[PDB]
Write an enzyme that holds these catalytic residues in place. Structure first.
Site, PDB file in Angstrom:
ATOM      1  N   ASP A  35       0.588  -1.187  -0.044  1.00  0.00           N
ATOM      2  CA  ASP A  35      -0.019  -0.063   0.084  1.00  0.00           C
ATOM      3  C   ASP A  35       1.020   1.238   0.107  1.00  0.00           C
ATOM      4  O   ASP A  35       1.200   1.898   1.000  1.00  0.00           O
ATOM      5  CB  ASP A  35      -0.523   0.112   1.312  1.00  0.00           C
ATOM      6  CG  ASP A  35      -1.616   1.154   1.204  1.00  0.00           C
ATOM      7  OD1 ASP A  35      -1.662   2.070   0.177  1.00  0.00           O
ATOM      8  OD2 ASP A  35      -2.432   1.427   2.467  1.00  0.00           O
ATOM      9  N   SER A 199      -0.112  15.619 -12.421  1.00  0.00           N
ATOM     10  CA  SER A 199      -0.889  15.191 -13.773  1.00  0.00           C
ATOM     11  C   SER A 199      -0.685  16.425 -14.073  1.00  0.00           C
ATOM     12  O   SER A 199      -1.389  17.248 -14.231  1.00  0.00           O
ATOM     13  CB  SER A 199      -1.954  14.154 -13.609  1.00  0.00           C
ATOM     14  OG  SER A 199      -2.404  13.938 -15.245  1.00  0.00           O
TER      15      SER A 199
END
Ligand SMILES: Cc1c(C=O)c(-c2nnc3c4c(C[n+]5cc6c(C)n(C)c(C)c6c(Cl)n5)n(C)c(C)c4cnn23)c(C)n1C
Ligand SMILES: Cc1c2cnnc(Cl)c2c(C)n1C
EC number: 3.4.23.22
Length: 330
Positions: A35, A199
């Site tokens: 994770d 992004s």
């Protein structure tokens, strides 16, 4: 040193991925959920409330000659889906794919919430976010990667998740056969403890690319892709019959649909998520309504590049002095 381990979907939908981890002496192998959005290595154990164990493999520290109780240490964590767990702490030897850390904090669960009990396939979590998020008190502990880093050939790990198929976590090296083209690296902020990046935009299907900054986290623990409501609405508007369902808890779509791809930007590079990666199947058994793999982050407070996005790429988690993330197509 290096390590390399295969990671396997827990079910036919890629709801999560499990990776075998050796703990203790002699080894006890548990299948953990790696994770990159949390920083605790915790396991079901011989200390876990018996009624809360339902088929998981447990760690028994009393059977490990290298286990040592970390005196006075406790831990307690709650995750983005509302699940939680807590307990006490041992140190022990932990190996992943041939890479060994001695003295790793292994957090033994005394309590787990219902979603953990109900999932027999996940024996615990191995956190790979920054150690500043580790919950052990009164002395915070380091992640497996942080402990291993200085011994690794290069201070990196990579995630190569499969679509409906196994994949690989590597530590300490970049497998140049595992991707196409080049790896594009992008800046990371560690201020919130996550692998947080920006992004450069998105496209839906064959549509034109929209240049827009989207700040979010690379999170292997998260099943889905969570993005701003504007972006998600633009995606689902290209699917006949798709709608946001408050009762179901997100966007749903007719199971008969053919889903468009979704592209996200990494610098000037582009990662294309095929449409079928976005299909999470019937909302309930036998339904013709299907759950979408791209969902709104409104209310979460952060965008999450979860498995839907990451499995379309070869992803480098670069733990150099200034961390960065790398993405390649594959
Ligand atoms: C803000 C956030 C998240 C941040 O991460 C998040 C999320 N998304 N997948 C997972 C998680 C997983 C992965 N996971 C998802 C699964 C799904 C969708 N299904 C049907 C099953 C059976 C699952 C299992 Cl066993 N495991 N695990 C194990 C944990 C502890 C998670 C915690 N949160 N989580 C959600 C739903 N939200 C809103
Ligand atoms: C109804 C439903 C879901 C809800 N949340 N996440 C996932 Cl991956 C789901 C699949 N079916």
């Amino acid at each position: 040193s290096t390590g390399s381990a295969t990671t396997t979907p827990i079910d036919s939908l890629d709801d999560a991925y499990i990776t075998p981890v050796q703990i203790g002496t002699p080894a006890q192998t548990l299948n953990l959920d790696f994770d990159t959005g949390s920083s605790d290595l915790w396991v079901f154990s011989s200390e876990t409330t018996a009624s809360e164990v339902d088929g998981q493999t447990i760690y028994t520290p009393s059977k490990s000659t290298t286990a040592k109780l970390l005196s006075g240490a406790t831990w307690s964590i709650s995750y983005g889906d509302g699940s939680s767990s807590s307990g006490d702490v041992y140190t022990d030897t932990v190996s992943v794919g041939g890479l060994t850390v001695t003295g790793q904090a292994v957090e033994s669960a005394k309590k787990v919430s219902s979603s953990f009990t109900e999932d027999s396939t996940i024996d615990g979590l191995l956190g790979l976010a920054f150690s500043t998020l580790n919950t052990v008190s009164p002395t915070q502990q380091k992640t497996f990667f942080d402990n291993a880093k200085a011994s690794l050939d290069s201070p990196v790990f990579t995630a190569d998740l499969g679509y409906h198929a196994p994949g690989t976590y590597n530590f300490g090296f970049i497998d140049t056969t595992a991707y196409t083209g080049s790896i594009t690296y992008t800046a990371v902020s560690t201020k919130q403890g996550f692998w947080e990046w920006t992004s450069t935009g998105y496209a839906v299907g064959s549509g034109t690319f929209k240049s827009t900054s989207i700040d979010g986290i690379a999170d292997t623990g998260t099943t889905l892709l969570y993005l701003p409501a504007t972006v998600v609405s633009a995606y689902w508007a290209q699917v006949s019959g798709a709608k946001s369902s408050s009762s179901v808890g997100g966007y749903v779509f007719p199971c008969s649909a053919t889903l468009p791809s979704f592209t996200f930007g990494v610098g000037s590079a582009r990662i294309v998520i095929p449409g079928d990666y976005i299909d999470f199947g019937p909302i309930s058994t036998g339904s013709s309504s299907c759950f979408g793999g791209i969902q709104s982050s409104a209310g979460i407070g952060i965008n999450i590049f979860g498995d839907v996005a990451l499995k379309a790429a070869f992803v480098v988690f670069n733990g150099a002095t200034t961390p960065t993330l790398g993405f390649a197509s594959k």
